[PDB]
Design an enzyme around this catalytic site. Structure first.
Site, PDB file in Angstrom:
ATOM      1  CD  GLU A  93      44.157  43.773  42.148  1.00 47.56           C
ATOM      2  OE1 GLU A  93      44.872  42.936  41.577  1.00 47.56           O
ATOM      3  OE2 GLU A  93      43.648  43.602  43.283  1.00 47.56           O
ATOM      4  CG  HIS A 125      41.943  35.279  44.056  1.00 46.03           C
ATOM      5  ND1 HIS A 125      42.876  34.303  44.330  1.00 46.03           N
ATOM      6  CD2 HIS A 125      42.578  36.198  43.285  1.00 46.03           C
ATOM      7  CE1 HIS A 125      44.012  34.601  43.721  1.00 46.03           C
ATOM      8  NE2 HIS A 125      43.855  35.740  43.071  1.00 46.03           N
ATOM      9  CG  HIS A 155      45.399  46.858  46.936  1.00 46.43           C
ATOM     10  ND1 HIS A 155      46.596  46.643  47.587  1.00 46.43           N
ATOM     11  CD2 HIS A 155      45.195  45.767  46.154  1.00 46.43           C
ATOM     12  CE1 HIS A 155      47.102  45.475  47.218  1.00 46.43           C
ATOM     13  NE2 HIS A 155      46.273  44.924  46.346  1.00 46.43           N
ATOM     14  CD  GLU A 201      42.749  38.751  46.566  1.00 46.97           C
ATOM     15  OE1 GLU A 201      42.409  39.948  46.501  1.00 46.97           O
ATOM     16  OE2 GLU A 201      43.701  38.283  45.910  1.00 46.97           O
ATOM     17  CG  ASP A 257      42.078  44.219  46.824  1.00 44.80           C
ATOM     18  OD1 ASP A 257      41.603  44.399  47.950  1.00 44.80           O
ATOM     19  OD2 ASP A 257      42.865  43.276  46.594  1.00 44.80           O
ATOM     20  CG  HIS A 276      40.129  41.216  44.402  1.00 47.15           C
ATOM     21  ND1 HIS A 276      41.465  41.266  44.053  1.00 47.15           N
ATOM     22  CD2 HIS A 276      39.576  40.241  43.638  1.00 47.15           C
ATOM     23  CE1 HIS A 276      41.710  40.350  43.128  1.00 47.15           C
ATOM     24  NE2 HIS A 276      40.580  39.722  42.847  1.00 47.15           N
ATOM     25  CD  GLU A 285      50.519  44.313  46.946  1.00 45.90           C
ATOM     26  OE1 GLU A 285      50.001  44.183  45.809  1.00 45.90           O
ATOM     27  OE2 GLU A 285      50.116  43.738  47.973  1.00 45.90           O
TER      28      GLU A 285
HETATM   29 MG   LIG Z   1      43.139  42.187  44.645  1.00 49.17          MG
END
Ligand SMILES: [Mg+2]
Ligand SMILES: O=C(CO)[C@@H](O)[C@H](O)[C@H](O)CO
Ligand SMILES: O=C(CO)[C@@H](O)[C@H](O)[C@H](O)CO
Ligand SMILES: [Mg+2]
Ligand SMILES: [Mg+2]
Ligand SMILES: [Mg+2]
Lengths: 283, 283, 285, 285
Positions: free
Chosen positions: B145, B8, B181, B239, B178, B204, B151
């Protein structure tokens, strides 16, 4: 083809005589397991009729396991090995067992001091090819258990086991992994499962010190996530060396207690593993 | 069909103007990655031909990502979400991108204080169905995602992402996970991968604090073993929030440095992740 | 007492002969490690002047380690063990090494077939007491390494090693742990460090399969957090059997390559370990 | 002060009204925990003498915790914050609680959108100093809980909490850590424990998704080994939001069930955590 949760009966019986079979089957019922693994130290002496009747009556599935005695190590004495396996295959079939697994390709204590050779592997494939024939004739499968470098120098990893199964070319030999051995031998514990994924039908869920699952160094989340991810539908067998007879324990390098008591091992370990199997969707 | 390792570009560029695109592509080549992920904070301003020529010249592949701004949050303003996404989808395709991914179904900062409702999900599904048709017409895919509870309150887990993909019924929407997360949301990190296995095409690889992969709390062995076990062949995208522009940083709750400097993040993190990918056979 | 990062020289040479010492010292300097650990498996064969010159020229520290040969296993042949340890101590000191550690109480591959007995430990304590007096005379310390159940039946855990240090009552014997051995023996790897904390001065950061650290099953975050927590300040030493010293091959049980080569283990494992030590703020880093 | 195992009462009731306290105290005794953590989110609604009677007849210790409402965030409205804390302190003491902990310096859900400024910490120090003197008046201690970046922008790590404690200079403020929060904020979970070791008296053993400990992503072996290594002797408390106090639901972000029910979390999580504390030899277990 084993399914669900089982226990190696080492915790109640390594001598599978009449009272020993009774004691192990009773414990299996108390812990509500789906199958038992019957060690056959001396396959000739097993009363097949008594065990068959016990398993049928309690709706308990079973498989058997052994390690080859020195007089019959396949790598050097392949004719004796075939003889010893044929007896154990017949006994397993007769008592209702669905498979004979374990160190069926050699013994605990084999060590030359040098890497395993093509000659050793050639003898082993001869033995397994013959035993697999015989096992097909009795309606059971054979399992090749990868064990750590100190117990045997020939098959230590899932990838070595798969190579042997490819060498033999039979269809009724599966891979049997053990988290205690993989904790030493696998380059990341999930790699043993990954490498054996096409042949993995049985796994011993055993803590790093042979004590209580959940309370050692095995990477249980990696183990269970990887089993779920390869779609494992075979046998999950709890193994612990607690309350093993001294003679058998000393042969496997148990120089000191692996845990406090059965209450600790079964009361903490079995829920831990069942909870993990639920968590990752194996069930 | 993104493949291999990428990054990223937020570590060098969040504003994808001409010098920003040049700088990010230069970093990508230095680190010898297979693809870049281009954040599209302001899709109308993107010079598609400049970026396309950069990618083709340097044999580099790309996808884009975004989160919806509040005026176009799909859950409550689906018509504006669709208009915003069509613009981003066209820009993505015009520059040579293969997918538009990220929080395409909502925005960072969505929170009602109660569980997501069916009405919210109906609006998201309509937006994503219109977007998927538009993407199909430009030859690209869309990625949903899963992000953590703070978030966005709507899609936090792999299983929730798959549910939305099923509600929409399009075949060109994939799941984008990700590890940062998942480290919060998944009940065992491998379960997000398992739950998303049929639709997972992008992940990610981010450390638990957005710093340096390998040096946090993410369960990397379980992550890579489970990716390998499900046969993952999509994009592995590193990332980190290091060197992010402070406005964008503060918006994602970066209140302090996530790591010393790029030299720490790329010099330690990227080898760590590539070594793990090789270790578990993803490469 | 050893500090910083070091490497067991099996990374680079099978034997500590003259060309092996040249090769290992040159490799150590390439990686900027603080010390090397030299096997003392053939004491009469070690050219101590040649090694001491190399170490002092290149500002490299060193200690030695060994396992006892069966002719001198302390548990059963304590007088032979004492004589053998005195020779190994003298050669260690003559080459400039600062400690002699490892399985100094028995064999790599030692097993009676039954659990360890008081009579065995009584002999080991006598041997270590005599050896520790000799070491003190040469200015070096002794280390007792806990190894797994398949390599020795006498001292497998941090708590067993500490009990031996208490049984001997010397002031110059420390505990040496090995993450590869603790991966098998300790009920949670941190427990070996906790149990040994009062005497721990040396640790083998060895991966679970003797391969590349960071790429096996060892619980490295737990290991480093616990080392930091107890204020560890001794030696952090890599051990990967890229080369196998012949006199201990049978007991160490390396039957297949632990890694591709020394470049892979040093190039990937050492940065990982240094990065972890810095992450958890280990004294000296 | 606090010792042994305890449970945040959101396990069993949404509010600390009279029936809620009936239930929670009953459950707490079913599981044979040593203490409960009572949210002090609605002081004017707390019947202190009733709770205090339940605690003594059932031989059960307690502390309280809170987050500050936006009207009294110490960051921006310090005089309001002092007044709110004095009330919360008084009611905590009135009911038999031994400390008031949590986000006592700000809001659960507090953010400015920018990194914290020196002006903000100045205000917090003034608040906590005032609060700490009032707390001593009533014989109780104050706890500063580090929480993750999404719940508060001011104190997110063990090290930041220690710095605030060292700024205020008070003898009776401890650090409160939470494994759920450390799972996000600490660069290696053990580092939060290490950084807080001089002041750490209370830890939430909360799973990474606020569900059942043992069945998320927290690195429990590293957590328990590091707690044993620093000699931790304070409270080990579970926290799972089976029930959600309304005053903090918006900031805590529980949008779906954290677990099947209280029976799953207590029935599997507590034995897991008790077994781990014994495994690593934690003081008192
Ligand atoms: Mg991500
Ligand atoms: O870890 C070990 C024993 O398994 C080695 O450290 C041994 O002591 C050394 O090889 C002797 O040089
Ligand atoms: O972990 C936390 C904050 O996320 C809680 O402990 C909080 O302080 C408590 O709910 C207030 O009683
Ligand atoms: Mg086994
Ligand atoms: Mg060693
Ligand atoms: Mg908390």
């Amino acid at each position: 083809t084993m399914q669900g949760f089982g226990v190696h009966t080492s915790m109640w019986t390594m001598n599978w005589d009449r009272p020993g079979a009774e004691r192990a089957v009773a414990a299996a019922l108390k812990y509500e397991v789906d199958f038992i693994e019957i060690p056959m130290l001396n396959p000739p002496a097993v009363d097949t009729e008594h065990t068959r009747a016990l398993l049928e009556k309690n709706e308990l599935r079973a498989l058997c396991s052994l390690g080859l005695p020195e007089r019959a190590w396949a790598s050097v004495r392949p004719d004796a090995a075939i003889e010893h396996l044929k007896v154990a295959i017949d006994k397993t079939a007769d008592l209702g067992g669905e498979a004979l697994s374990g160190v069926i390709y050699g013994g605990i204590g084999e060590r030359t001091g040098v890497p395993p050779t093509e000659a050793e592997y050639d003898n082993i494939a001869r033995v397994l090819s013959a035993a697999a024939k015989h096992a097909k004739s009795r309606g059971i499968e054979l399992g090749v258990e990868a064990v750590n470098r100190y117990e045997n120098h020939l098959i230590n990893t899932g990838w070595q086991a798969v190579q042997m199964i490819e060498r033999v070319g039979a269809d009724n030999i599966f891979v049997h992994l053990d988290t205690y051995h993989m904790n030493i031998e696998e380059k990341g514990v999930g790699n043993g499962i990954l490498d054996a994924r096409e042949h993995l039908k049985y796994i011993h869920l055993s803590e790093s010190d042979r004590g209580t699952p959940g309370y050692g160094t095995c990477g249980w989340d990696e183990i269970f996530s990887t089993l779920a991810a390869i779609g494992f539908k075979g046998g999950l067998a709890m193994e612990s060396f607690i309350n093993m007879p001294p003679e058998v324990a000393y042969g496997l390098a148990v120089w000191r207690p692996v845990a406090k008591d059965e209450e600790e091992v079964m009361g903490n370990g079995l829920p831990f593993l069942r909870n993990k199997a639920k968590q990752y969707g194996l069930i």
